[PDB]
Amino acid sequence: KELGKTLRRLRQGKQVSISSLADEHLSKSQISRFERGESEISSSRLLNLLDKLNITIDEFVSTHSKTHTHFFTLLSRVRKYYAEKNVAKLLKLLEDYAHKDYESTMIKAILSSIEPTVEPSEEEVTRLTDYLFSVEQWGYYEIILLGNCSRFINYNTLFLLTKEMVTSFAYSEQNKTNKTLVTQLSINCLIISIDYSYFDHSHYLIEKIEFLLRDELNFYEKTVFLYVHGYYKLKQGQVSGKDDMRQALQIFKYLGEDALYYSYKEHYRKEV
Amino acid sequence: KELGKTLRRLRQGKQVSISSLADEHLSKSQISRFERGESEISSSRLLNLLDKLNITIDEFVSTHSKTHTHFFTLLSRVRKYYAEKNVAKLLKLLEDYAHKDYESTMIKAILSSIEPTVEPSEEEVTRLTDYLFSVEQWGYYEIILLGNCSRFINYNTLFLLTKEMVTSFAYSEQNKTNKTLVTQLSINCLIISIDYSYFDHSHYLIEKIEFLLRDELNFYEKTVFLYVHGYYKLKQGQVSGKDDMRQALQIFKYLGEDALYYSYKEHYRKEVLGDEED
Ligand SMILES: [Cl-]
Ligand SMILES: [K+]
Ligand SMILES: [K+]
Ligand SMILES: [K+]
Structure with missing residues (x-):
């Protein structure tokens, strides 16, 4: 879907790098493949990303396109x-x-x-x-x-x-x-x-x-x-x-x- | 962690059958396995399930999560x-x-x-x-x-x-x-x-x-x-x-x-x- 495009724009808006978001349990390739729409990510993993970025799940879905x-x-x-x-x-x-x-x-x-x-x-x-x-x-x-x-x-x-x-x-x-x-x-x-x-x-x-x-x-x-x-x-x-x-x-x-x-x-x- | 257990209770409360929710993006067996806590599900497909059930993501996370x-x-x-x-x-x-x-x-x-x-x-x-x-x-x-x-x-x-x-x-x-x-x-x-x-x-x-x-x-x-x-x-x-x-x-x-x-x-x-x- 376009959820990854939304995640990338919000992440870049906060001047946060993919490397700083990734850790020992969610890799940079997984974040990037999700941001590029080439891969899906689990609900718990998306919520963990937004928590690290200090973005509400409600802000994320209302930031998303027209969904x-x-x-x-x-x-x-x-x-x-x-x-x-x-x-x-x-x-x-x-x-x-x-x-x-x-x-x-x-x-x-x-x-x-x-x-x-x-x-x-x-x-x-x-x-x-x-x-x-x-x-x-x-x-x-x-x-x-x-x-x-x-x-x-x-x-x-x-x-x-x-x-x-x-x-x-x-x-x-x-x-x-x-x-x-x-x-x-x-x-x-x-x-x-x-x-x-x-x-x-x-x-x-x-x-x-x-x-x-x-x-x-x-x-x-x-x-x-x-x-x-x-x-x-x-x-x-x-x-x-x-x-x-x-x-x-x-x-x-x-x-x-x-x-x-x-x-x-x-x-x-x-x-x- | 057991997102499906919470989704199951909300769906059953709405008198909705798993058959009514299955489509080309998620099958009946895939929904059942998630509700039993036996598997995870992608963010896009969870949001589609919640959309069919008319539950916003905010009410779902606040219902399941105790943190x-x-x-x-x-x-x-x-x-x-x-x-x-x-x-x-x-x-x-x-x-x-x-x-x-x-x-x-x-x-x-x-x-x-x-x-x-x-x-x-x-x-x-x-x-x-x-x-x-x-x-x-x-x-x-x-x-x-x-x-x-x-x-x-x-x-x-x-x-x-x-x-x-x-x-x-x-x-x-x-x-x-x-x-x-x-x-x-x-x-x-x-x-x-x-x-x-x-x-x-x-x-x-x-x-x-x-x-x-x-x-x-x-x-x-x-x-x-x-x-x-x-x-x-x-x-x-x-x-x-x-x-x-x-x-x-x-x-x-x-x-x-x-x-x-x-x-x-x-x-x-x-x-x-x-x-x-x-
Ligand atoms: Cl005015
Ligand atoms: K996804
Ligand atoms: K006074
Ligand atoms: K009943």
């Missing part, structure tokens, strides 16, 4: 076509992914928001939720599928899926990307539980979100959680919840986040 | 010992990495903030800045080194290094970790440029930070930027910069960020309500 994952290739395209509300490109895209079950279900859920003829069937959603109940750990794939399809999942399943996601998601201490997404979807599920006064779920979600935010910055999620948690208190008769919601609005205004400000201020003039 | 990289293992230890303010543990740590030039210099810089007896020499810092200038594309390694050693880099080299980092850092559409740290380091450099009134450098860094924050969430960096940009506005005669600085303090307070609130309020009181002469 984005099958999923992020679709996600990047679907986000482009949705930003332009291009229904024609989205259906051609849905046509190109008809052989992929969960992927086409997600495209239908996204496309339904801007064109009402399209929507995922309940059999398609259940196939997705069945899959999501079965996974050992929740990765970027599972999290994005849930977030883009949550409007078509009945609440009780959405809460159980949220509980599975919070207790078994894959995050690293160096890449908190999945942890941040899990927090946002947990807050979104907390919002719905408060709307229906399912305060048994709200109290559980508040505990998990507070734990997810511990030892983290995540000021956006804390601001949203400040509003949502205050919304929870207000619906339980605690008038102090109004102050938390107004403080969150103040943060949006202070940072010039006008879209979030009006989106949450409209929710505040409602329900009050 | 971190060389530099992040060091980083975790420094951060744990620094949080404890334990000078003795940081000194033993310094000795475990004394054979690593840049790493030792970073430890000395970090340790110096709570132990003035130890300090990185100017020859140690110059070798590090030499390395940082020589890099074609800055990554997580180069960014962390510059951040933790900034207190011992003279301002003119720090701004030039900031220019290089900010111009040539690896862009990732899916992992904003490096972009966020670059933003934080650019804000830190803008602070120093405002203190010393290098207002041409300030305009440059301001324009860079504005792009980095755009289309991102990153409310923390925006809150610090609101304060620091208001600080620059005050130093240029714009009294409205005080309101921006006070609004940033209110954000820290509303979110319960007590440590950040008192650090920036102490800076506010010294620079806005401090000593006035004549």
